[PDB]
Amino acid sequence: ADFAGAMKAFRGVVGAEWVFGDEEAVVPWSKTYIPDPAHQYKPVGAVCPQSVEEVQEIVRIANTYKQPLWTVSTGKNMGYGMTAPATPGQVVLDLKRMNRILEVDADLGTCLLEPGVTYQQLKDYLEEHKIPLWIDVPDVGPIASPVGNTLDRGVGYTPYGEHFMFQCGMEVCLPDGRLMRTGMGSIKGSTAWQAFKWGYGPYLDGLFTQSNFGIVTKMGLWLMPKPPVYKPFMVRHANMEDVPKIIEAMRPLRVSNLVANCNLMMSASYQLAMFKRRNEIVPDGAPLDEASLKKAASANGLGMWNTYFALYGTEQTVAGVEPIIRATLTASGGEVLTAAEMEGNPWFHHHQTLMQGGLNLDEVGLLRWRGAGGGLAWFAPVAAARGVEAERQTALAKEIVEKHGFDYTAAYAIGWRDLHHIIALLFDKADPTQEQKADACYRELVTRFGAQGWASYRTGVNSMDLVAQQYGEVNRDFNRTLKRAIDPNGILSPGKSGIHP
Amino acid sequence: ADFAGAMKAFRGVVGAEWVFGDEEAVVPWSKTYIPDPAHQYKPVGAVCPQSVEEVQEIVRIANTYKQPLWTVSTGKNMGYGMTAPATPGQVVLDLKRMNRILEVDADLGTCLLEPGVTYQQLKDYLEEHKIPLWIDVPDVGPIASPVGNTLDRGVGYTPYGEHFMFQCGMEVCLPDGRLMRTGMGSIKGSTAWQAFKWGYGPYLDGLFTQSNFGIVTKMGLWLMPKPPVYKPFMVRHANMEDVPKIIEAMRPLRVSNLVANCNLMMSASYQLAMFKRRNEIVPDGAPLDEASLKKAASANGLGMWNTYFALYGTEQTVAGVEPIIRATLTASGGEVLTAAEMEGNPWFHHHQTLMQGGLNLDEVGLLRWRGAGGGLAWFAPVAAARGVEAERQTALAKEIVEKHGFDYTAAYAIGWRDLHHIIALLFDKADPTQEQKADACYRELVTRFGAQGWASYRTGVNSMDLVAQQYGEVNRDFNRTLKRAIDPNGILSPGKSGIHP
Ligand SMILES: Cc1cc2nc3c(=O)[nH]c(=O)nc-3n(C[C@H](O)[C@H](O)[C@H](O)COP(=O)(O)OP(=O)(O)OC[C@H]3O[C@@H](n4cnc5c(N)ncnc54)[C@H](O)[C@@H]3O)c2cc1C
Ligand SMILES: Cc1cc2nc3c(=O)[nH]c(=O)nc-3n(C[C@H](O)[C@H](O)[C@H](O)COP(=O)(O)OP(=O)(O)OC[C@H]3O[C@@H](n4cnc5c(N)ncnc54)[C@H](O)[C@@H]3O)c2cc1C
Ligand SMILES: COc1cc(C=O)ccc1O
Ligand SMILES: COc1cc(C=O)ccc1O
């Protein structure tokens, strides 16, 4: 890499005030929450363009100077690396200034977005124009990107919660600086770019998700019509061991699509961690015992597991399914509760907001759990939607985290036929011993889960190689063949998803 | 290519009795219904393996001898080329004997299939085991493949009608002879291969749809639970010119998901062609005039457009949406009819079967429309689900087919935000002048649609290059870059989707 030559050329493209080219200037891009005992996940520069033409020029320069770029949209991948690159020596290509809402089609229920568009911005746009469409939001703070989130295949909590399913068309700047539109978008003045996903020939959009094959400059997204009626529910289960029965109850409701939104099944420990520090619940040095958890949860109107779902449509369609749902969940030991029973309950309010695609009030309490706080890494294994799988994964995760002196703080995001088991590894990052222990714990989670046949849907920059190692060697080789063909100079996000030039 | 050396080595793998290696022996793989005036779409051999290990050996030999393989599952791509390869000198790799149903998961609603499994076979398997799951079938005759259809991104008529959306996990033999499993499948003894679509890192399954980058040897598919209640409907519209009003009435019902199955909006001419020859309707030499069509359709209980939809659930969920659906469609000039009104109507019966994923036992009447018959080519442009687009595409297609002496015989398959406009170009293939005219007509359809911003979702081997030409030059280059990297010897289906080594 010729770093100095690249950065000088980048100033010529975007202006000197949008290039950040030394240790002090790149501080805003360098903070992470994942464990990093060797201090190895850090950018060496950042560049912030406002147009796709600037992106193209930047890519051309990256090739000439052999200077890799780590592309982000808004860069709020918290617990997964924020804007830290996977390998040393990279410049962050921060697309936050490319924040234009290009189209919103009220009739077809679609939009077309630049990467820097935020969820807040899109929701404001819809409301200001009185367009009766909803968004589908992850459980994040004030800033996050539909484009960035979708490209990492993230998740929200309406019927449109599996974000990548609802993507339709994209524009990519390929590593040589040429633009390519997927689906119907390469037909000049196509009116169907946001209407038909697949196009003609090989379906390419998935190559640009969790990958380093292209820079997405525009993305189409389907949006759900606002329903006449929205009815949120909470199911409370009393015992830690209820895990398998909850999944077995929900599975039929989801496979038959009586419930259609992604359902967060939240542990009491996670819920408490959102609003309380660990030392409000148990002494430092003591385990997070189930009696203390149960007492604390009960005092706050929570069970040991609390699962959130909603119904959408009319009073009549809601009444068609609500009885069967109530029967199935009550038979599993759950108490089904509505807004009228959960008045003033901040967890119910939190999920009632999420499940209509509302924006919650900034405040990530999770970062202050243990000691000085500041340590969070997601460990996010997949399971089939089978109670026995959830039972076993809960047991193994708890065993491993507790062996390293950490707590089990987790949720299951229940999907159609799958679960995303979301495990927050919360630690005191400011204590270097605790950061080292969290690193060791994380490695043990990945390795031992992999040995039982389980691996992650998504992971942070510090674990992308170790997670890749859980999946097949042929897969690893095939990804590398694609990388080398698409990006011969290896200038896009080396190490993303364990893919190296 | 060294054809003789390749075919000798193939006999060693599968047995001499499963290699077909001269003009006479390959006759069963040679008949097509598309126009082919130069007789250029034809295989030079066929090989029929029964195991994945045989496939892998075949692929190794194909590399050694530089002998291209044109891979099919059951090969019933009627109107798209059957088993004829896109370029000369290819051997059909016919996977019909790999017909094992590997798994069916009743609780998660999934299955895992080899390519040769037919729809009939899978339906029989479900029925015989009393498994309360349905299939989703295209409107084909007795033999077709869930795998082959899904890989060409085909369509059926239940809520699971957009077939590729419901695929989950695949195994592929790569061009070098190695097997790769997508999604969660490359984790040994993963139990989530049919549970979670995306896996980790780039999403690859779409690369193996409408493509020549691999041979699919196993594919997973989600299956819909059988609903307590199934209620089919037919909407009759009186006038040829109703097209835009029908799309505008159905679009909100589909965008809001009050109707969830893919809806065939059938022209009267197509419907009549299913069961009648053209000279039962008008004289040879006369146009298929709207008054003759209306009279013939009316005598059969058909409108000029007849649109089929269904509701699935309980008596109460159906009652939740049926009034709104009826009001929307009646306001558009439609008459909404149910089984009780359509007793003895063979078209209603045909669609009522399709919309519950039933197998129609029938010959393909369409192949006998004009003269000696035998000519069929699908022209299948996409539209957004907007009335004005359907109006304009119907007008243009009518203009073009009638200019060349052919009829407009078409349907729209209404999707969520899209339409597949399915235009059957029916001709007398046994008359060489008519075959030439149909060839010219088809070229004009593709070219002139492309100039208005419209192009095909799928096409036949004789037009794959011309359809590729309607999409972007960068797309074409990118697909060629992938092809050369993935299949360096160019031995898998050269010319599929216009992708050439
Ligand atoms: C308390 C908490 C709760 C959370 N809840 C959720 C949740 O419910 N669901 C969820 O999905 N996540 C969740 N997250 C994780 C994360 O914060 C969000 O997913 C967030 O939306 C990701 O950041 P972002 O939108 O800024 O995307 P980015 O950080 O901009 O993008 C993510 C990644 O995509 C790639 N990328 C982004 N833009 C492009 C581009 N234009 N071209 C190519 N590649 C690009 C890069 O690899 C990048 O690192 C949570 C995090 C926390 C701390
Ligand atoms: C009257 C009529 C009505 C029809 N209605 C419909 C309809 O409603 N919906 C619809 O979708 N189609 C329809 N068709 C078109 C077609 O007949 C079906 O799509 C049929 O299912 C395709 O044949 P097949 O299943 O044998 O697949 P195949 O012909 O085996 O496969 C199709 C293509 O996929 C690729 N392929 C197949 N198997 C493999 C593999 N294992 N590895 C890699 N590539 C492979 C090849 O390119 C192959 O040519 C209709 C046809 C007619 C004549
Ligand atoms: C469903 O995916 C996620 C959910 C969350 C929090 O709810 C955090 C990280 C994730 O990847
Ligand atoms: C929805 O796709 C198709 C439908 C048909 C017949 O109804 C034929 C070919 C197709 O591609």
Side-chain angles (χ1 to χ4, degrees), chain B residues 3-28:
Chain B
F3 175 79
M7 299 297 274
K8 182 187 178 167
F10 296 152
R11 302 177 176 101
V13 177
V14 297
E17 69 277 15
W18 291 116
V19 178
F20 302 87
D22 54 48
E23 180 169 321
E24 174 186 5
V26 85
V27 157

PDB file of all heavy atoms in Angstrom, chain B residues 3-28:
ATOM      1  N   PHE B   3     -14.901 -35.823 -28.019  1.00  0.00           N
ATOM      2  CA  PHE B   3     -16.183 -36.436 -27.762  1.00  0.00           C
ATOM      3  C   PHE B   3     -16.046 -37.946 -27.567  1.00  0.00           C
ATOM      4  O   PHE B   3     -16.610 -38.470 -26.623  1.00  0.00           O
ATOM      5  CB  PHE B   3     -17.146 -36.072 -28.891  1.00  0.00           C
ATOM      6  CG  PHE B   3     -18.502 -36.714 -28.846  1.00  0.00           C
ATOM      7  CD1 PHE B   3     -19.510 -36.253 -28.000  1.00  0.00           C
ATOM      8  CD2 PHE B   3     -18.744 -37.856 -29.589  1.00  0.00           C
ATOM      9  CE1 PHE B   3     -20.778 -36.817 -28.029  1.00  0.00           C
ATOM     10  CE2 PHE B   3     -19.973 -38.468 -29.553  1.00  0.00           C
ATOM     11  CZ  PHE B   3     -21.000 -37.944 -28.787  1.00  0.00           C
ATOM     12  N   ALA B   4     -15.342 -38.652 -28.456  1.00  0.00           N
ATOM     13  CA  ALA B   4     -15.258 -40.102 -28.366  1.00  0.00           C
ATOM     14  C   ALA B   4     -14.580 -40.556 -27.067  1.00  0.00           C
ATOM     15  O   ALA B   4     -15.039 -41.521 -26.437  1.00  0.00           O
ATOM     16  CB  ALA B   4     -14.545 -40.666 -29.561  1.00  0.00           C
ATOM     17  N   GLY B   5     -13.535 -39.835 -26.645  1.00  0.00           N
ATOM     18  CA  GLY B   5     -12.818 -40.194 -25.426  1.00  0.00           C
ATOM     19  C   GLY B   5     -13.702 -39.956 -24.202  1.00  0.00           C
ATOM     20  O   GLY B   5     -13.756 -40.775 -23.297  1.00  0.00           O
ATOM     21  N   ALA B   6     -14.419 -38.817 -24.196  1.00  0.00           N
ATOM     22  CA  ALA B   6     -15.336 -38.501 -23.110  1.00  0.00           C
ATOM     23  C   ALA B   6     -16.428 -39.577 -22.976  1.00  0.00           C
ATOM     24  O   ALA B   6     -16.682 -40.087 -21.874  1.00  0.00           O
ATOM     25  CB  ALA B   6     -15.938 -37.106 -23.336  1.00  0.00           C
ATOM     26  N   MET B   7     -17.087 -39.934 -24.085  1.00  0.00           N
ATOM     27  CA  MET B   7     -18.205 -40.863 -24.036  1.00  0.00           C
ATOM     28  C   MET B   7     -17.730 -42.260 -23.638  1.00  0.00           C
ATOM     29  O   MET B   7     -18.383 -42.961 -22.855  1.00  0.00           O
ATOM     30  CB  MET B   7     -18.938 -40.888 -25.396  1.00  0.00           C
ATOM     31  CG  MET B   7     -19.508 -39.508 -25.780  1.00  0.00           C
ATOM     32  SD  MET B   7     -20.789 -38.907 -24.629  1.00  0.00           S
ATOM     33  CE  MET B   7     -22.250 -39.672 -25.328  1.00  0.00           C
ATOM     34  N   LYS B   8     -16.539 -42.658 -24.079  1.00  0.00           N
ATOM     35  CA  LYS B   8     -16.012 -43.940 -23.637  1.00  0.00           C
ATOM     36  C   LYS B   8     -15.801 -43.979 -22.112  1.00  0.00           C
ATOM     37  O   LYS B   8     -16.192 -44.942 -21.438  1.00  0.00           O
ATOM     38  CB  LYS B   8     -14.716 -44.292 -24.384  1.00  0.00           C
ATOM     39  CG  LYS B   8     -14.158 -45.636 -23.980  1.00  0.00           C
ATOM     40  CD  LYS B   8     -12.808 -45.904 -24.580  1.00  0.00           C
ATOM     41  CE  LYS B   8     -12.244 -47.234 -24.125  1.00  0.00           C
ATOM     42  NZ  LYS B   8     -11.084 -47.602 -24.977  1.00  0.00           N
ATOM     43  N   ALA B   9     -15.230 -42.896 -21.560  1.00  0.00           N
ATOM     44  CA  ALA B   9     -15.001 -42.785 -20.126  1.00  0.00           C
ATOM     45  C   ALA B   9     -16.312 -42.721 -19.375  1.00  0.00           C
ATOM     46  O   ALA B   9     -16.398 -43.304 -18.287  1.00  0.00           O
ATOM     47  CB  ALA B   9     -14.112 -41.565 -19.848  1.00  0.00           C
ATOM     48  N   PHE B  10     -17.330 -42.020 -19.941  1.00  0.00           N
ATOM     49  CA  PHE B  10     -18.648 -42.014 -19.314  1.00  0.00           C
ATOM     50  C   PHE B  10     -19.248 -43.424 -19.205  1.00  0.00           C
ATOM     51  O   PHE B  10     -19.879 -43.735 -18.180  1.00  0.00           O
ATOM     52  CB  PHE B  10     -19.629 -41.082 -20.031  1.00  0.00           C
ATOM     53  CG  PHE B  10     -19.335 -39.591 -20.051  1.00  0.00           C
ATOM     54  CD1 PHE B  10     -19.788 -38.813 -21.098  1.00  0.00           C
ATOM     55  CD2 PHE B  10     -18.544 -38.994 -19.079  1.00  0.00           C
ATOM     56  CE1 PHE B  10     -19.508 -37.446 -21.140  1.00  0.00           C
ATOM     57  CE2 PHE B  10     -18.235 -37.645 -19.151  1.00  0.00           C
ATOM     58  CZ  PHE B  10     -18.758 -36.870 -20.159  1.00  0.00           C
ATOM     59  N   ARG B  11     -19.147 -44.260 -20.245  1.00  0.00           N
ATOM     60  CA  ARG B  11     -19.683 -45.617 -20.135  1.00  0.00           C
ATOM     61  C   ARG B  11     -19.073 -46.378 -18.945  1.00  0.00           C
ATOM     62  O   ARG B  11     -19.738 -47.190 -18.288  1.00  0.00           O
ATOM     63  CB  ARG B  11     -19.456 -46.399 -21.434  1.00  0.00           C
ATOM     64  CG  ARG B  11     -20.069 -45.758 -22.663  1.00  0.00           C
ATOM     65  CD  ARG B  11     -19.763 -46.512 -23.969  1.00  0.00           C
ATOM     66  NE  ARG B  11     -20.473 -45.846 -25.036  1.00  0.00           N
ATOM     67  CZ  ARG B  11     -19.934 -44.989 -25.910  1.00  0.00           C
ATOM     68  NH1 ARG B  11     -18.625 -44.878 -26.044  1.00  0.00           N
ATOM     69  NH2 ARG B  11     -20.734 -44.224 -26.616  1.00  0.00           N
ATOM     70  N   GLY B  12     -17.809 -46.095 -18.633  1.00  0.00           N
ATOM     71  CA  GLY B  12     -17.117 -46.692 -17.523  1.00  0.00           C
ATOM     72  C   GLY B  12     -17.697 -46.286 -16.173  1.00  0.00           C
ATOM     73  O   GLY B  12     -17.609 -47.050 -15.214  1.00  0.00           O
ATOM     74  N   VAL B  13     -18.282 -45.076 -16.120  1.00  0.00           N
ATOM     75  CA  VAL B  13     -18.851 -44.546 -14.894  1.00  0.00           C
ATOM     76  C   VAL B  13     -20.271 -45.063 -14.693  1.00  0.00           C
ATOM     77  O   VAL B  13     -20.583 -45.536 -13.600  1.00  0.00           O
ATOM     78  CB  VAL B  13     -18.812 -43.007 -14.886  1.00  0.00           C
ATOM     79  CG1 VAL B  13     -19.480 -42.458 -13.619  1.00  0.00           C
ATOM     80  CG2 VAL B  13     -17.370 -42.519 -14.977  1.00  0.00           C
ATOM     81  N   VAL B  14     -21.143 -44.882 -15.687  1.00  0.00           N
ATOM     82  CA  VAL B  14     -22.554 -45.170 -15.487  1.00  0.00           C
ATOM     83  C   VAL B  14     -22.995 -46.518 -16.080  1.00  0.00           C
ATOM     84  O   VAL B  14     -24.129 -46.930 -15.843  1.00  0.00           O
ATOM     85  CB  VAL B  14     -23.424 -44.036 -16.029  1.00  0.00           C
ATOM     86  CG1 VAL B  14     -23.129 -42.753 -15.251  1.00  0.00           C
ATOM     87  CG2 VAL B  14     -23.286 -43.877 -17.533  1.00  0.00           C
ATOM     88  N   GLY B  15     -22.143 -47.145 -16.889  1.00  0.00           N
ATOM     89  CA  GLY B  15     -22.579 -48.262 -17.728  1.00  0.00           C
ATOM     90  C   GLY B  15     -22.947 -47.817 -19.139  1.00  0.00           C
ATOM     91  O   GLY B  15     -23.610 -46.791 -19.341  1.00  0.00           O
ATOM     92  N   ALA B  16     -22.637 -48.672 -20.134  1.00  0.00           N
ATOM     93  CA  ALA B  16     -22.936 -48.385 -21.515  1.00  0.00           C
ATOM     94  C   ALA B  16     -24.408 -48.107 -21.755  1.00  0.00           C
ATOM     95  O   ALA B  16     -24.753 -47.332 -22.651  1.00  0.00           O
ATOM     96  CB  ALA B  16     -22.451 -49.522 -22.386  1.00  0.00           C
ATOM     97  N   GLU B  17     -25.279 -48.741 -20.959  1.00  0.00           N
ATOM     98  CA  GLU B  17     -26.700 -48.650 -21.213  1.00  0.00           C
ATOM     99  C   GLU B  17     -27.258 -47.282 -20.794  1.00  0.00           C
ATOM    100  O   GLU B  17     -28.404 -46.962 -21.165  1.00  0.00           O
ATOM    101  CB  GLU B  17     -27.476 -49.786 -20.536  1.00  0.00           C
ATOM    102  CG  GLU B  17     -27.545 -49.738 -19.024  1.00  0.00           C
ATOM    103  CD  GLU B  17     -26.389 -50.292 -18.213  1.00  0.00           C
ATOM    104  OE1 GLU B  17     -25.287 -50.512 -18.785  1.00  0.00           O
ATOM    105  OE2 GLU B  17     -26.594 -50.556 -16.985  1.00  0.00           O
ATOM    106  N   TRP B  18     -26.449 -46.445 -20.127  1.00  0.00           N
ATOM    107  CA  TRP B  18     -26.888 -45.115 -19.687  1.00  0.00           C
ATOM    108  C   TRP B  18     -26.122 -43.990 -20.382  1.00  0.00           C
ATOM    109  O   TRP B  18     -26.150 -42.809 -19.966  1.00  0.00           O
ATOM    110  CB  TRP B  18     -26.790 -45.021 -18.168  1.00  0.00           C
ATOM    111  CG  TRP B  18     -27.786 -45.890 -17.476  1.00  0.00           C
ATOM    112  CD1 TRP B  18     -27.506 -46.952 -16.672  1.00  0.00           C
ATOM    113  CD2 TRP B  18     -29.206 -45.800 -17.556  1.00  0.00           C
ATOM    114  NE1 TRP B  18     -28.653 -47.545 -16.264  1.00  0.00           N
ATOM    115  CE2 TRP B  18     -29.709 -46.852 -16.765  1.00  0.00           C
ATOM    116  CE3 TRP B  18     -30.089 -44.918 -18.173  1.00  0.00           C
ATOM    117  CZ2 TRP B  18     -31.073 -47.025 -16.578  1.00  0.00           C
ATOM    118  CZ3 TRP B  18     -31.443 -45.099 -17.991  1.00  0.00           C
ATOM    119  CH2 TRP B  18     -31.907 -46.145 -17.202  1.00  0.00           C
ATOM    120  N   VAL B  19     -25.390 -44.332 -21.438  1.00  0.00           N
ATOM    121  CA  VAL B  19     -24.748 -43.373 -22.338  1.00  0.00           C
ATOM    122  C   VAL B  19     -25.359 -43.498 -23.729  1.00  0.00           C
ATOM    123  O   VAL B  19     -25.546 -44.614 -24.241  1.00  0.00           O
ATOM    124  CB  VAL B  19     -23.231 -43.574 -22.379  1.00  0.00           C
ATOM    125  CG1 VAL B  19     -22.558 -42.621 -23.352  1.00  0.00           C
ATOM    126  CG2 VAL B  19     -22.583 -43.443 -21.005  1.00  0.00           C
ATOM    127  N   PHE B  20     -25.679 -42.335 -24.316  1.00  0.00           N
ATOM    128  CA  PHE B  20     -26.390 -42.221 -25.584  1.00  0.00           C
ATOM    129  C   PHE B  20     -25.527 -41.347 -26.471  1.00  0.00           C
ATOM    130  O   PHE B  20     -25.408 -40.142 -26.248  1.00  0.00           O
ATOM    131  CB  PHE B  20     -27.785 -41.649 -25.310  1.00  0.00           C
ATOM    132  CG  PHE B  20     -28.546 -42.527 -24.348  1.00  0.00           C
ATOM    133  CD1 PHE B  20     -28.423 -42.353 -22.974  1.00  0.00           C
ATOM    134  CD2 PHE B  20     -29.342 -43.561 -24.829  1.00  0.00           C
ATOM    135  CE1 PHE B  20     -29.072 -43.197 -22.103  1.00  0.00           C
ATOM    136  CE2 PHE B  20     -30.020 -44.390 -23.949  1.00  0.00           C
ATOM    137  CZ  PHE B  20     -29.853 -44.227 -22.597  1.00  0.00           C
ATOM    138  N   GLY B  21     -24.896 -41.939 -27.486  1.00  0.00           N
ATOM    139  CA  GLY B  21     -23.695 -41.336 -28.051  1.00  0.00           C
ATOM    140  C   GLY B  21     -23.680 -41.223 -29.573  1.00  0.00           C
ATOM    141  O   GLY B  21     -22.602 -41.012 -30.150  1.00  0.00           O
ATOM    142  N   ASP B  22     -24.858 -41.273 -30.197  1.00  0.00           N
ATOM    143  CA  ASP B  22     -24.926 -40.946 -31.624  1.00  0.00           C
ATOM    144  C   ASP B  22     -26.272 -40.323 -31.970  1.00  0.00           C
ATOM    145  O   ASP B  22     -27.186 -40.303 -31.155  1.00  0.00           O
ATOM    146  CB  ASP B  22     -24.609 -42.157 -32.507  1.00  0.00           C
ATOM    147  CG  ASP B  22     -25.448 -43.383 -32.234  1.00  0.00           C
ATOM    148  OD1 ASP B  22     -26.691 -43.277 -32.145  1.00  0.00           O
ATOM    149  OD2 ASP B  22     -24.855 -44.447 -32.160  1.00  0.00           O
ATOM    150  N   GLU B  23     -26.412 -39.857 -33.213  1.00  0.00           N
ATOM    151  CA  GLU B  23     -27.597 -39.106 -33.616  1.00  0.00           C
ATOM    152  C   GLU B  23     -28.887 -39.868 -33.313  1.00  0.00           C
ATOM    153  O   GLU B  23     -29.844 -39.290 -32.792  1.00  0.00           O
ATOM    154  CB  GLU B  23     -27.579 -38.753 -35.106  1.00  0.00           C
ATOM    155  CG  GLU B  23     -28.826 -37.971 -35.522  1.00  0.00           C
ATOM    156  CD  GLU B  23     -28.794 -37.343 -36.908  1.00  0.00           C
ATOM    157  OE1 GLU B  23     -27.728 -36.832 -37.297  1.00  0.00           O
ATOM    158  OE2 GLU B  23     -29.854 -37.320 -37.573  1.00  0.00           O
ATOM    159  N   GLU B  24     -28.925 -41.164 -33.641  1.00  0.00           N
ATOM    160  CA  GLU B  24     -30.106 -41.983 -33.416  1.00  0.00           C
ATOM    161  C   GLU B  24     -30.393 -42.159 -31.922  1.00  0.00           C
ATOM    162  O   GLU B  24     -31.542 -42.158 -31.486  1.00  0.00           O
ATOM    163  CB  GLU B  24     -29.924 -43.355 -34.066  1.00  0.00           C
ATOM    164  CG  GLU B  24     -31.049 -44.340 -33.779  1.00  0.00           C
ATOM    165  CD  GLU B  24     -30.788 -45.747 -34.300  1.00  0.00           C
ATOM    166  OE1 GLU B  24     -29.672 -45.998 -34.821  1.00  0.00           O
ATOM    167  OE2 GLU B  24     -31.697 -46.600 -34.187  1.00  0.00           O
ATOM    168  N   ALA B  25     -29.350 -42.394 -31.131  1.00  0.00           N
ATOM    169  CA  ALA B  25     -29.558 -42.706 -29.732  1.00  0.00           C
ATOM    170  C   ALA B  25     -29.997 -41.433 -28.956  1.00  0.00           C
ATOM    171  O   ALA B  25     -30.674 -41.563 -27.926  1.00  0.00           O
ATOM    172  CB  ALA B  25     -28.311 -43.325 -29.164  1.00  0.00           C
ATOM    173  N   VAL B  26     -29.657 -40.231 -29.447  1.00  0.00           N
ATOM    174  CA  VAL B  26     -29.965 -38.994 -28.715  1.00  0.00           C
ATOM    175  C   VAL B  26     -31.305 -38.382 -29.156  1.00  0.00           C
ATOM    176  O   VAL B  26     -31.729 -37.349 -28.638  1.00  0.00           O
ATOM    177  CB  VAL B  26     -28.787 -37.995 -28.780  1.00  0.00           C
ATOM    178  CG1 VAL B  26     -28.809 -37.145 -30.032  1.00  0.00           C
ATOM    179  CG2 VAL B  26     -28.784 -37.121 -27.545  1.00  0.00           C
ATOM    180  N   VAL B  27     -32.058 -39.045 -30.065  1.00  0.00           N
ATOM    181  CA  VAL B  27     -33.371 -38.576 -30.492  1.00  0.00           C
ATOM    182  C   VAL B  27     -34.279 -38.247 -29.307  1.00  0.00           C
ATOM    183  O   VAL B  27     -34.981 -37.220 -29.305  1.00  0.00           O
ATOM    184  CB  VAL B  27     -34.025 -39.590 -31.461  1.00  0.00           C
ATOM    185  CG1 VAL B  27     -35.540 -39.467 -31.485  1.00  0.00           C
ATOM    186  CG2 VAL B  27     -33.421 -39.461 -32.846  1.00  0.00           C
ATOM    187  N   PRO B  28     -34.318 -39.051 -28.219  1.00  0.00           N
ATOM    188  CA  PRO B  28     -35.214 -38.714 -27.104  1.00  0.00           C
ATOM    189  C   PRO B  28     -34.910 -37.374 -26.402  1.00  0.00           C
ATOM    190  O   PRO B  28     -35.765 -36.885 -25.681  1.00  0.00           O
ATOM    191  CB  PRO B  28     -35.112 -39.930 -26.188  1.00  0.00           C
ATOM    192  CG  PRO B  28     -34.686 -41.044 -27.097  1.00  0.00           C
ATOM    193  CD  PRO B  28     -33.737 -40.383 -28.065  1.00  0.00           C
TER     194      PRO B  28
END
